Amino acid sequence: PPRPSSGELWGIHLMPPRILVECLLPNGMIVTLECLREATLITIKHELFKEARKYPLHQLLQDESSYIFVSVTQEAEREEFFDETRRLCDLRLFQPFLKVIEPVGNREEKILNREIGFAIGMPVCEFDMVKDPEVQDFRRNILNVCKEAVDLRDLNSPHSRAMYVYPPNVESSPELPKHIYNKLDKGQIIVVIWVIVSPNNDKQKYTLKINHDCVPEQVIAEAIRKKTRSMLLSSEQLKLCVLEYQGKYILKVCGCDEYFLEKYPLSQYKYIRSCIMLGRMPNLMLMAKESLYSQLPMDCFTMPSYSSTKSLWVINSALRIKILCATYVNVNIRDIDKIYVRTGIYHGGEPLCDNVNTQRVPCSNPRWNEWLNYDIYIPDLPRAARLCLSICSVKKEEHCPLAWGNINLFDYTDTLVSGKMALNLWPVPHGLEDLLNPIGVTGSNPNKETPCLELEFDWFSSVVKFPDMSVIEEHANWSVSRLRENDKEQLKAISTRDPLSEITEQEKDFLWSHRHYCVTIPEILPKLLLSVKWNSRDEVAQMYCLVKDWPPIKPEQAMELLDCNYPDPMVRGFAVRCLEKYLTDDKLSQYLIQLVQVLKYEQYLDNLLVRFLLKKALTNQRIGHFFFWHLKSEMHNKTVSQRFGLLLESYCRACGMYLKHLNRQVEAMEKLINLTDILKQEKKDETQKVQMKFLVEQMRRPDFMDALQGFLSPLNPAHQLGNLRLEECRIMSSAKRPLWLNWENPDIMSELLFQNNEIIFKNGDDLRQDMLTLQIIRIMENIWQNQGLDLRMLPYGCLSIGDCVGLIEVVRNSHTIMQIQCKGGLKGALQFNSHTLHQWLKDKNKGEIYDAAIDLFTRSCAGYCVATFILGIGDRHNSNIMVKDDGQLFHIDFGHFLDHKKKKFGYKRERVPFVLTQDFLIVISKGAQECTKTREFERFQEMCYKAYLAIRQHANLFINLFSMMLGSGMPELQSFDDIAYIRKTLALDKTEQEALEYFMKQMNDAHHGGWTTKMDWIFHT
Amino acid sequence: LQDAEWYWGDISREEVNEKLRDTADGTFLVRDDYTLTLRKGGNNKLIKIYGFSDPLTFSSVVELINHYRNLYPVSKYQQDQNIEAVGKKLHEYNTQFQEKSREYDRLYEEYTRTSQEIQMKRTAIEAFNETIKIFEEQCQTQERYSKEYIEKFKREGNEKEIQRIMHNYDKLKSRISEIIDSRRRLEEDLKKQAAEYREIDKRMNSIKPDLIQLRKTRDQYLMWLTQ
Ligand SMILES: C[C@H](Nc1ccc2c(c1)OCCn1cc(N3C(=O)OC[C@H]3C(F)F)nc1-2)C(N)=O
Ligand SMILES: Cc1c([C@@H](NC(=O)Nc2cnc(N)nc2)C(F)(F)F)oc2c(F)cc(F)cc12
């Protein structure tokens, strides 16, 4: 199994500088060899065979290079160590010993399997030894997706391969808002091209001034024109010369590995558009296609070693299941009286009938041996129907659960299963007081140590299968053959209502009645689907027919149909089809975290969503990267290990050379986890100067230097990480004492972007909340920008790469409000100046620039006021808020703003009070102390007004992004109850004009609390 | 009508879903326009309002219910256990609850920890098993090869080299016995801890209902002081 240690040896983080290893020889001798911790296997094999001549049977030992080492890893696996460059410390050994053997099978195959294993954090052989035919089916069938993807990639080589790697980093629309266009000179942009001339990297630069919407091929053409200037060519010779050569070159961003390989307007590339909006001057490097195409590997895809039915609608009986007996259950016979098995049939978390219990039975012996009869008929079962059961204690009369388990009533072959079934059960979540857990994972606990409940399903003298579509289409016409002026107005007004809005049982009938009209308002579909009665086969079969011929909808809307409320496979395939056809890679990348989460809701391993994502990951390596990490981050998790592992296996088997790069990232991350695990456990008492010494000492060693230099940033794999600057590495003074790391940017032209690449590694905290909050903030900004509201946010990078381990991107030239005040020389004042901040900006942006900085601060300040309100981020202070030198403000450190949300001992609801500090208002008003009535402040209030309304106007999208996360694992996004707050902030129950005034009140209420003395800044006396 | 017991002001749906949790199909309450929440098939149905559909037969909301009555409701009042003694027991039932609350968390701190350590041991044992298998194959490799050599040296007078072979052999098997001994001492640690787990579970399942009913009664003592 996967290991919990990152120790170099079982239950030991660091190997002593030298250790004894027992080397079992191929002539059956055993010698003990003292080794360096950091020694390679080649220097270990050399030294062994030398000393092996002292020992008997030295005569049988063939050439040193005829043999391979074997040992047992901390995953209890026989690893054959093919790559002998590897060091003893990096071998992940259980017990310090090696066995010298003759290599056996297909070397190529075995090496790749190891690489796939290491990558996914689980050995491939564990999958081979799994009997579930669904598993082994998935493994074989999914290679269709892999073959398709690999074909696309090597279809129009080598451009296609360069497209997979280095896909264009592009906005979703070419159009520019006016605030962006007005930023251009005259619809034009000044661009700097670069070329590497001499072997020792001598650089020439061409400064073009081109229209913003020129495609890269035209940029290159204009560059050719500038160089062929003064070569006595005719219009014809020149025009011919550009045409011939404009497509023998590609542009690349100087400083990172982004390329402009596709015919999009230059403005549409995110790097350019950023430069435009930042007022910076794009520095692109020009090179020949061969220079890139030659560096591409041209990888090869090995195919792995693993290569009487009655319908359901002709079985007119009531459903019934038999609870036989459990093995045990962990209940005290003192205190607790009796135990029973509660059951229920469910469609998602909607029950399809009444829940049915068994008779009471004494704790000590659980045997029931009775048929439970269920209040629906076998044809009336929907396709996504599930038994959800548990075992309960009974002690007024206080019921509680013990163990629980859920089952798909049809398997993945559409086969309504029958016969005997053992079901090893799961422990209850933390705070779950409910008798049943239908949201929990469907299937049997792979922990066989757990209580095990046997079941019997009714037999029907043949295999029962869910009907074909033809059968279901017919029955729709059997089902039917048996308006007003304010009606159309009414069901227009309930598509505009949000998903979290509550629909009356009248409105459900209303919708169902007018279901044929609804096809003309196709965004109503989600609501109509909630009006369906899924226990009624008659309604379902008709709805299947509507969905089949339903108009596509925006992918932002199709997404809703992938959350927990829409279990039906037909409804889901629709969503996947909408996504297949209308979802840009831009948006797929932007919403990838939710799309990965909702894989967990899928009933079966092989499905349309998985096949869609897997294809996009294997087609676009930017997507694939975060595909891999979002999955890898959860492999520790009992519940999803097997699914995600299986999915990771398919990815890693077809992703190409990137598997190699991903190993380098993984190995680096492992060393960081181990190193920091030490600092957290064994040296938590030791002082922070002593820790620095130890850190330095370990990072110096050659095994660590090799591991953590020359790999790609997981935050952004366009960025290379070169040599470590250990002098700049340090332990930060924050919660969980995270590492601050620093790498040289090894780009030939790094000076034109950034020469140092800084990442915060944080071992200890769950980062999923930060990830999600930042994503939201990004989306908010994307909405604003696209509508032409120029509010600048700063959603810096954050990535969970494991169980409470992740990276944060550092932003340069930025400081907490606190840090800014201390810089200005406090003078020991108990209260901070309040003009200090504005002062700091003036000093930083002198004269010419000044107004631009205030503008940016005003715009950023506005975005975060609105974002912070809507989301209810109450917990802001002078070390959460940060400001860049240019004036841009942003918020950091989320993941604690929900800690005080739940009531307690009746203390009323903790209001999230919208306030803005006086220091910020002063900056907005350029130093005026009457800063509550300036033009600056009105213009600012207006920004906030428009922003608020824009997010409100897109409320459904945010609601759906949160809804998809509910089954994830985050303890703070558990139920639709947790999201509800946003309805209050956006005022979804009121009018638009009432909401604006609500927000206007809330905002004007803030600054009534001005001149609040704040009599001590450290301790808040 | 405002006074009548089954009306619950204008409360959120989380609060409502909480109370309609785990009831028999029939139970109900009204809340704010007026809507009526209800159980049917074990679901929380929503029904707007005087009447539902076309024929608006009724004059007030309190009548409407009572015709469909011909359903046992949730009560704003009915809190089956002077203002002075009740103000005391809130400090007593809330301390009794909060002492168990912190005892449960510490039980969970053990529960979780103990759960992981067990899974670790199970991995370790799998490892030892594979380790030991490898040494056992090394033993059979030594027999295959030393067979032809031990007979040669036995055929010569040379039993100096017999002694050298078997010094290696004795070390190997002595080593095996030590590894088997380590697996065994872990197998007992695993079985000891698995029972420690099973026990920590039994205590949690015994303190789980105690924690619920201590919250139910404590919550209704607050409802008496605010009414
Ligand atoms: C020179 C140094 N620069 C800096 C520091 C922290 C962050 C940052 C930049 O920007 C990236 C955003 N960020 C986010 C966080 N953190 C966070 O989100 O939680 C804790 C804290 C860090 F300790 F991880 N820290 C930073 C400074 N001002 O002291
Ligand atoms: C849950 C959740 C939210 C909700 N916000 C609040 O409930 N704020 C609030 C209200 N009252 C108090 N006392 N404290 C905080 C909401 F945004 F959905 F409304 O936002 C989240 C977010 F951005 C990220 C994430 F991982 C989870 C969430």
Author numbering:
A (entry chain A): 2 to 308, 323 to 410, 416 to 502, 523 to 1061
B (entry chain B): 328 to 359, 367 to 383, 390 to 410, 425 to 435, 441 to 586
From the paper:
Comparison between WT and H1047R cocrystal structures with STX-478 revealed no significant difference in the allosteric site. Kinase-domain alignment revealed no conformational variability in the domain (RMSD 0.3Å). Similarly, a detailed analysis of the allosteric site and key STX-478 interactions showed no difference between the WT- and H1047R-bound structures. Because X-ray crystallography did not identify structural differences in STX-478 binding to mutant compared with WT PI3Kα, we asked if differences in binding kinetics could explain mutant selectivity. Surface plasmon resonance (SPR) assay results confirmed the potency and mutant selectivity observed in the biochemical assays, indicating that STX-478 has low nanomolar binding affinity (equilibrium dissociation constant, KD = 4.7 nmol/L) for the H1047R mutant, 15-fold lower binding affinity for WT PI3Kα (KD = 70 nmol/L), and intermediate binding to the helical-domain mutant E545K (KD = 47 nmol/L). However, SPR analysis further revealed that STX-478 has faster association constants (kon) for H1047R and E545K compared with WT PI3Kα. In contrast, duvelisib, a nonselective, orthosteric PI3Kα inhibitor, showed approximately equal binding affinity and kinetics for mutant and WT PI3Kα. These data indicate that STX-478 mutant selectivity is derived from kinetic differences in binding between mutant and WT PI3Kα and suggest that the allosteric site occupied by STX-478 is more accessible in mutant forms of the enzyme. Although X-ray cocrystal structures did not provide a structural explanation for mutant selectivity, differences in binding kinetics provide a strong hypothesis for kinase-domain mutant selectivity that is somewhat weaker for helical-domain mutant selectivity.
The phosphoinositide 3-kinase (PI3K)/AKT axis is pivotal in the development of cancer, with oncogenic genetic alterations in PI3Kα occurring in approximately 14% of cancers. These mutations are found throughout the PIK3CA gene but are highly enriched at hotspot amino acid sites in the helical (E542K, E545K) and kinase (H1047R/L) domains, though the frequency of PI3Kα hotspot mutations varies across cancers. To test this hypothesis, we developed STX-478, a second-generation, allosteric, mutant-selective PI3Kα inhibitor that interacts with a previously undescribed allosteric pocket within PI3Kα. X-ray cocrystals were generated to identify the binding site of STX-478 on PI3Kα.
